[PDB]
């Protein structure tokens, strides 16, 4: 019950959804094979290529929700190229997840790459 996970699980951070039909919105929907932890990540890359708005929705354990909220906080305010620099190791140490909960960070990382990808696909 680490305080960092508890902290992100309470007082929700950037919980919501964005307009899927919008051209400048990229949706990332992924899941975990072991347990079902499913996070939907949406990034709004408006203006001259900057993620101004980001929202997430997660079905999963407190670690998954904390990882998704942390990823949403980090991905905001940077261009799409800077967003791909986020790795699962960074989230894992920030949240200090136990070895049993290793898969949670990789799922959030997979969620960011997916949204960035959707956005680039719709941009052409």
């Amino acid at each position: 019950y680490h305080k960092k996970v508890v902290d992100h699980y309470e007082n929700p951070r950037n919980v919501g959804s964005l307009d899927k039909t919008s051209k400048n919105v990229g949706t990332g929907l992924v899941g975990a094979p072991a347990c079902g932890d499913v996070m939907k990540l949406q990034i709004q890359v408006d203006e001259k290529g900057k993620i101004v708005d980001a929202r997430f929705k997660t079905f999963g354990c407190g670690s998954a929700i904390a990882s998704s909220s942390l990823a949403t906080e980090w991905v905001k305010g940077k261009t799409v190229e800077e967003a791909l620099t986020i790795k699962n190791t960074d989230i894992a140490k920030e949240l200090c997840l136990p070895p049993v909960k290793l898969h949670c960070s990789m799922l959030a990382e997979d969620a960011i790459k997916a949204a960035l990808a959707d956005y680039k696909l719709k941009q052409e």
Partner: peptide
């Protein structure tokens, strides 16, 4: 809803 999140 997942049960660990609800338990927390």
């Amino acid at each position: 809803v997942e049960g660990e999140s609800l338990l927390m």
